[PDB]
Amino acid sequence: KREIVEFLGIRTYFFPNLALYAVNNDELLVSDPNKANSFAAYVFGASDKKPSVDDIVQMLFPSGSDSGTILTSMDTLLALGPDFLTEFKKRNQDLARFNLTHDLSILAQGDEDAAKKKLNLMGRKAKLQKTEAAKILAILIKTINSEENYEKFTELSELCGLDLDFDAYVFTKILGLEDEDTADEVEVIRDNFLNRLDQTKPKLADIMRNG
């Protein structure tokens, strides 16, 4: 089941290992950020150096990941876009040996366009269900089916309705969705997250707010 989790003021669906990293390496990020993980340091505003694709994959799929971790991170791969589809397919092929699969596997099976029209209708009905799990699936589908970056940002912004502002912000940062057309909205998303992080980790929040 798609389940939101929380780590000491960081509420997340898509990025649980990144949230855990920030819990475990708070002092490092605040006091010696050039020793910290590059993906974490970039997200939290402690470095302007961009993470590599490999940095992202290793944070999503740490050694020893179990099937639940893998399935959740495969959702994140889909949200990040076609750059990550080969990684998604490799992870899905491995799961099949255990009789497991990602529930949106039709996206990896050719005729992607036809699958996305069917998924569009599925996602619209999922959003009308009353569970967090269904609403996450709906947002994921709408994000996958977005062509342009402004549309992708608009659909990912719906994560804030589930108090997943952290995830919306991480996607914005990693996918480069902040520009002149979206900057004022990105500021609201960032501030929503920081208003919560201030309550548990104010020094880390201060880095993110300033530097």
Next chain:
Amino acid sequence: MDTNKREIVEFLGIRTYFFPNLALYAVNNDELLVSDPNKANSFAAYVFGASDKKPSVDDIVQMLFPSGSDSGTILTSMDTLLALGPDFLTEFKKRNQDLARFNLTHDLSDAAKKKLNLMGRKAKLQKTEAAKILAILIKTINSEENYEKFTELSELCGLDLDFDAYVFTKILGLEDEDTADEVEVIRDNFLNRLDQTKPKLADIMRNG
């Protein structure tokens, strides 16, 4: 109510922002809707499936603005008039002129639609029901065709305002071959609440 703030209200299982007088009417008059629907209110009878006669603009306005409405009731019902489109804008302007004598006004009183669009996007990101309702209203107003308008009104279900989404779908004629399966989900969400408090209303809406 005697407040400027947008507030969701509830009456016996019926949660609503845009149609509080209609919700209360149905709670008070469910047996009449069952047993003598032609003598019941025509707007209520149409929404709940007791009659296929469409209400008039005047029937709808009278339900939204009953005798004795206070300022919050007027302001809320003015939101409803905006979402109901061009046949209701003259009434909106009449009501807004009344309010000005008391130093009150509706807060939304191509260029304006772009400014409104940016305002609605930032409102949706706030953490209050009042801001989310405003955002949905703006997105509805700025919609240019029925399928887009239905898509934006559907967001009301995210605030458990399925009743309002259903009423708008019925009055604006938004149920068609493209939207019918989604309309069924909205209807079923509302029926799920009704089955627990007004089984009679649920039965009419399912049967007749």
